[PDB]
Amino acid sequence: NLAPLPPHVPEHLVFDFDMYNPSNLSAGVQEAWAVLQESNVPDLVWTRCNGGHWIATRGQLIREAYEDYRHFSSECPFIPREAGEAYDFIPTSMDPPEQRQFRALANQVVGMPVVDKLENRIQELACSLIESLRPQGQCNFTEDYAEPFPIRIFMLLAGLPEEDIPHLKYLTDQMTRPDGSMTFAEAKEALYDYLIPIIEQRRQKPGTDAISIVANGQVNGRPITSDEAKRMCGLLLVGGLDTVVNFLSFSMEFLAKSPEHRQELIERPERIPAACEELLRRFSLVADGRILTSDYEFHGVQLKKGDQILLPQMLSGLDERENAAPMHVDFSRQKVSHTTFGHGSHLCLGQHLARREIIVTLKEWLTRIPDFSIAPGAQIQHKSGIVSGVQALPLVWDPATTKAV
Ligand code: HEM
């Protein structure tokens, strides 16, 4: 369905891109989105899909809009927008100055010191999962590793029972690549409903887990309230349970298709941190937006107050104006330019945990199962949304070529 074109939007700027089901999804999701950056396509277009909204196609515009919170606000309505409902996550649905006090507390639960503490449990789980798969000579990567690895580490961090995974995983899916069984407002409320009693419990009997830290936290010397804690934890669950999961499948799919890139990392393990960054650029997967606070002309385009604008984080690094041969994976790339973890006051606070999980995966995997391929005849399908992903990734390998550790 295409929403009627608003009177202020010029017809020459129309480009009906569907972020939840892009026209060329079969070429790969990043490729489908990259069609927006072609010379024939304007730097800023309006799509009538999903209620109608702007889409900044170039990294320069995407970066600029994320820096200007005064015009481009994070008090985001959904896409498609829902009547009387909008995002209220903390600190993600807030604009500075208000947003700032909340980042510190969030940073305290998923930040660097926390990642350092998790280090050995992270290494242990990756190794444990990979060793059990190794003798099989085959696996369904998405469900066998991509999902359990990051999710179990997060549940551990959050002090949540692993039995709650199917439920939470279903809900976070609805917040990124919804199948239509729930609205964003219902999915979000269910996440909140799950958290409420948990926050109360830990507020009274605190632990060292992420939920306890938020529940008993302080924002700028003031105690966070139950509701603010609920809204922060809700956001953390989405980030912690969904984002890395999908990214890992893009990376493993690529590696399974490029023996040359596998061998490179095998021979030069010191290049893994660099490979992680490069893969983060090439397989960037998030795309959310902002809302205009007033009538404003941006790069020759008249934007109206209340207009929604999607600023795809995934697009910046794929822009040939930012990186030469952007669709090519080059571990030795000199200046890996991207906005995969965001840009502006809302830079991803879980970026350190993400990188650590990717780097460990790459080392542990290539060290035990160095040679692997995609199952013969398999058609890998990608799904587009606020956080794009891989439907399934059947891999195969000869156990005789594996190294047991
Ligand atoms: C590869 C994985 C990840 C990617 C690519 C990613 C990407 C992003 C992006 C693009 C944003 C900014 C959204 C905006 O500006 O509206 C963001 C925000 C955030 N992410 Fe992630 N993320 C990842 C993993 C995680 C993980 C594991 C967590 C852990 C809980 C997490 C926690 C957060 C938080 C707390 C923020 C909010 C920052 C704020 O609003 O000030 N992310 N992430």
PDB file of N, CA, C and O in Angstrom, residues 162-190:
ATOM      1  N   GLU A 162      17.163 -18.926  31.062  1.00  0.00           N
ATOM      2  CA  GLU A 162      17.242 -19.270  29.641  1.00  0.00           C
ATOM      3  C   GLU A 162      15.930 -19.810  29.080  1.00  0.00           C
ATOM      4  O   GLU A 162      15.710 -19.778  27.869  1.00  0.00           O
ATOM      5  N   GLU A 163      15.054 -20.299  29.956  1.00  0.00           N
ATOM      6  CA  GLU A 163      13.755 -20.811  29.521  1.00  0.00           C
ATOM      7  C   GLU A 163      12.893 -19.670  28.957  1.00  0.00           C
ATOM      8  O   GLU A 163      11.985 -19.906  28.173  1.00  0.00           O
ATOM      9  N   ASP A 164      13.221 -18.433  29.323  1.00  0.00           N
ATOM     10  CA  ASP A 164      12.480 -17.262  28.858  1.00  0.00           C
ATOM     11  C   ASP A 164      12.893 -16.811  27.459  1.00  0.00           C
ATOM     12  O   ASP A 164      12.240 -15.948  26.864  1.00  0.00           O
ATOM     13  N   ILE A 165      13.925 -17.444  26.907  1.00  0.00           N
ATOM     14  CA  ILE A 165      14.417 -17.086  25.580  1.00  0.00           C
ATOM     15  C   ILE A 165      13.396 -17.143  24.438  1.00  0.00           C
ATOM     16  O   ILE A 165      13.218 -16.147  23.743  1.00  0.00           O
ATOM     17  N   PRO A 166      12.681 -18.273  24.254  1.00  0.00           N
ATOM     18  CA  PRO A 166      11.700 -18.337  23.157  1.00  0.00           C
ATOM     19  C   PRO A 166      10.708 -17.168  23.163  1.00  0.00           C
ATOM     20  O   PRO A 166      10.385 -16.600  22.109  1.00  0.00           O
ATOM     21  N   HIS A 167      10.233 -16.813  24.356  1.00  0.00           N
ATOM     22  CA  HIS A 167       9.278 -15.726  24.522  1.00  0.00           C
ATOM     23  C   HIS A 167       9.891 -14.362  24.189  1.00  0.00           C
ATOM     24  O   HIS A 167       9.341 -13.609  23.381  1.00  0.00           O
ATOM     25  N   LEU A 168      11.024 -14.053  24.808  1.00  0.00           N
ATOM     26  CA  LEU A 168      11.711 -12.783  24.586  1.00  0.00           C
ATOM     27  C   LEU A 168      12.222 -12.620  23.149  1.00  0.00           C
ATOM     28  O   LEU A 168      12.171 -11.524  22.582  1.00  0.00           O
ATOM     29  N   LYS A 169      12.696 -13.718  22.574  1.00  0.00           N
ATOM     30  CA  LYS A 169      13.209 -13.755  21.211  1.00  0.00           C
ATOM     31  C   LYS A 169      12.070 -13.450  20.236  1.00  0.00           C
ATOM     32  O   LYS A 169      12.241 -12.700  19.271  1.00  0.00           O
ATOM     33  N   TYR A 170      10.885 -13.968  20.530  1.00  0.00           N
ATOM     34  CA  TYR A 170       9.737 -13.707  19.679  1.00  0.00           C
ATOM     35  C   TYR A 170       9.372 -12.219  19.740  1.00  0.00           C
ATOM     36  O   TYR A 170       9.040 -11.608  18.721  1.00  0.00           O
ATOM     37  N   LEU A 171       9.404 -11.654  20.942  1.00  0.00           N
ATOM     38  CA  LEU A 171       9.065 -10.255  21.132  1.00  0.00           C
ATOM     39  C   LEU A 171      10.061  -9.290  20.491  1.00  0.00           C
ATOM     40  O   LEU A 171       9.653  -8.312  19.857  1.00  0.00           O
ATOM     41  N   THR A 172      11.355  -9.561  20.642  1.00  0.00           N
ATOM     42  CA  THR A 172      12.368  -8.695  20.056  1.00  0.00           C
ATOM     43  C   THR A 172      12.291  -8.780  18.531  1.00  0.00           C
ATOM     44  O   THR A 172      12.563  -7.799  17.838  1.00  0.00           O
ATOM     45  N   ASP A 173      11.891  -9.940  18.010  1.00  0.00           N
ATOM     46  CA  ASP A 173      11.731 -10.122  16.564  1.00  0.00           C
ATOM     47  C   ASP A 173      10.631  -9.189  16.079  1.00  0.00           C
ATOM     48  O   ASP A 173      10.712  -8.612  14.996  1.00  0.00           O
ATOM     49  N   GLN A 174       9.574  -9.083  16.872  1.00  0.00           N
ATOM     50  CA  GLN A 174       8.450  -8.230  16.504  1.00  0.00           C
ATOM     51  C   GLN A 174       8.797  -6.747  16.529  1.00  0.00           C
ATOM     52  O   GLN A 174       8.128  -5.946  15.888  1.00  0.00           O
ATOM     53  N   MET A 175       9.876  -6.390  17.221  1.00  0.00           N
ATOM     54  CA  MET A 175      10.306  -4.997  17.285  1.00  0.00           C
ATOM     55  C   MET A 175      11.267  -4.639  16.143  1.00  0.00           C
ATOM     56  O   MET A 175      11.610  -3.470  15.967  1.00  0.00           O
ATOM     57  N   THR A 176      11.702  -5.632  15.370  1.00  0.00           N
ATOM     58  CA  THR A 176      12.658  -5.383  14.287  1.00  0.00           C
ATOM     59  C   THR A 176      12.213  -5.847  12.900  1.00  0.00           C
ATOM     60  O   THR A 176      12.378  -5.121  11.915  1.00  0.00           O
ATOM     61  N   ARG A 177      11.715  -7.077  12.821  1.00  0.00           N
ATOM     62  CA  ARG A 177      11.233  -7.659  11.571  1.00  0.00           C
ATOM     63  C   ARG A 177       9.879  -8.295  11.914  1.00  0.00           C
ATOM     64  O   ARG A 177       9.726  -9.515  11.898  1.00  0.00           O
ATOM     65  N   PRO A 178       8.871  -7.461  12.212  1.00  0.00           N
ATOM     66  CA  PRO A 178       7.535  -7.950  12.572  1.00  0.00           C
ATOM     67  C   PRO A 178       6.827  -8.789  11.517  1.00  0.00           C
ATOM     68  O   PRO A 178       6.832  -8.448  10.335  1.00  0.00           O
ATOM     69  N   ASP A 179       6.227  -9.895  11.948  1.00  0.00           N
ATOM     70  CA  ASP A 179       5.487 -10.746  11.028  1.00  0.00           C
ATOM     71  C   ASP A 179       4.015 -10.313  10.927  1.00  0.00           C
ATOM     72  O   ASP A 179       3.244 -10.881  10.150  1.00  0.00           O
ATOM     73  N   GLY A 180       3.628  -9.323  11.731  1.00  0.00           N
ATOM     74  CA  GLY A 180       2.259  -8.840  11.697  1.00  0.00           C
ATOM     75  C   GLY A 180       1.293  -9.398  12.735  1.00  0.00           C
ATOM     76  O   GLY A 180       0.125  -9.024  12.728  1.00  0.00           O
ATOM     77  N   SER A 181       1.760 -10.272  13.626  1.00  0.00           N
ATOM     78  CA  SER A 181       0.898 -10.846  14.663  1.00  0.00           C
ATOM     79  C   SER A 181       0.752  -9.884  15.842  1.00  0.00           C
ATOM     80  O   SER A 181      -0.106 -10.066  16.703  1.00  0.00           O
ATOM     81  N   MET A 182       1.601  -8.861  15.873  1.00  0.00           N
ATOM     82  CA  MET A 182       1.572  -7.848  16.930  1.00  0.00           C
ATOM     83  C   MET A 182       1.946  -6.504  16.347  1.00  0.00           C
ATOM     84  O   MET A 182       2.676  -6.436  15.351  1.00  0.00           O
ATOM     85  N   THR A 183       1.460  -5.437  16.975  1.00  0.00           N
ATOM     86  CA  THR A 183       1.806  -4.081  16.558  1.00  0.00           C
ATOM     87  C   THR A 183       3.092  -3.780  17.337  1.00  0.00           C
ATOM     88  O   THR A 183       3.448  -4.529  18.252  1.00  0.00           O
ATOM     89  N   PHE A 184       3.799  -2.710  16.984  1.00  0.00           N
ATOM     90  CA  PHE A 184       5.012  -2.351  17.718  1.00  0.00           C
ATOM     91  C   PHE A 184       4.621  -1.978  19.156  1.00  0.00           C
ATOM     92  O   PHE A 184       5.370  -2.231  20.094  1.00  0.00           O
ATOM     93  N   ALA A 185       3.438  -1.385  19.322  1.00  0.00           N
ATOM     94  CA  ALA A 185       2.960  -0.982  20.646  1.00  0.00           C
ATOM     95  C   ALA A 185       2.673  -2.191  21.536  1.00  0.00           C
ATOM     96  O   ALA A 185       2.930  -2.158  22.735  1.00  0.00           O
ATOM     97  N   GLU A 186       2.145  -3.258  20.949  1.00  0.00           N
ATOM     98  CA  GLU A 186       1.853  -4.467  21.715  1.00  0.00           C
ATOM     99  C   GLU A 186       3.132  -5.239  22.033  1.00  0.00           C
ATOM    100  O   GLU A 186       3.305  -5.727  23.145  1.00  0.00           O
ATOM    101  N   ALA A 187       4.036  -5.327  21.062  1.00  0.00           N
ATOM    102  CA  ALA A 187       5.296  -6.031  21.264  1.00  0.00           C
ATOM    103  C   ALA A 187       6.075  -5.355  22.389  1.00  0.00           C
ATOM    104  O   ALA A 187       6.524  -6.009  23.332  1.00  0.00           O
ATOM    105  N   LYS A 188       6.167  -4.032  22.312  1.00  0.00           N
ATOM    106  CA  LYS A 188       6.881  -3.241  23.307  1.00  0.00           C
ATOM    107  C   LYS A 188       6.266  -3.377  24.699  1.00  0.00           C
ATOM    108  O   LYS A 188       6.979  -3.549  25.692  1.00  0.00           O
ATOM    109  N   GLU A 189       4.944  -3.297  24.775  1.00  0.00           N
ATOM    110  CA  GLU A 189       4.265  -3.416  26.058  1.00  0.00           C
ATOM    111  C   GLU A 189       4.495  -4.794  26.695  1.00  0.00           C
ATOM    112  O   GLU A 189       4.613  -4.900  27.909  1.00  0.00           O
ATOM    113  N   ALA A 190       4.584  -5.838  25.877  1.00  0.00           N
ATOM    114  CA  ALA A 190       4.812  -7.195  26.378  1.00  0.00           C
ATOM    115  C   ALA A 190       6.209  -7.312  26.966  1.00  0.00           C
ATOM    116  O   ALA A 190       6.430  -8.044  27.938  1.00  0.00           O
TER     117      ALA A 190
END
